Design a protein around this ligand. Structure first.
Ligand SMILES: [Ca+2]
Ligand SMILES: [Cl-]
Lengths: 67, 64, 64
């Protein structure tokens, strides 16, 4: 009947909540964070400048070795 | 029996409230694929510049 | 009292459907620990190769 329908709906939801809990637990354990990324970004900012300076230094040497 | 059903529904609502809070915390904290790809691209661009510098330096070394 | 229970069940169903869709979205967007580890290792490669080139360039300059 009507109580039976409501029980059956709540069974469906019980299962859905169980699965959502499992999925969220997983995302939390697998998540790389914004902060982790910013830490690498900061290192890449350093290296960007270093590679540019190296390019300028190698260009100067090439020209020198050129005469 | 209705009480026990009403109790189960309130237990499930409580778990859903906690999940909503957890999801919002995830969204706040998570790095995303697009931004990781942007950074990885920049690293690869730099790695390619370095590989080319390595070859130029080698060549210069053989010239001297 | 059945109406009270029906309305709580409606709150639950609606909130669960919303969460399902949000969790699906986040699964597609969220970069992982493993992804970050691989990018950390690429940046290690880059910083190590930069340092070696810095040394090789300083040496070559002294030689010239
Ligand atoms: Ca490593
Ligand atoms: Cl470094």
């Amino acid at each position: 009947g009507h109580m039976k329908q409501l029980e059956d709906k709540v069974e469906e939801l019980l299962s859905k909540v169980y699965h959502l809990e499992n999925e969220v637990a997983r995302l939390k354990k697998l998540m790389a964070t914004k902060d982790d990324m910013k830490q690498l970004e900061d290192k890449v900012e350093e290296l960007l400048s270093k590679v540019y300076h190296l390019e300028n230094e190698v260009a100067r040497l090439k020209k020198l070795v050129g005469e």
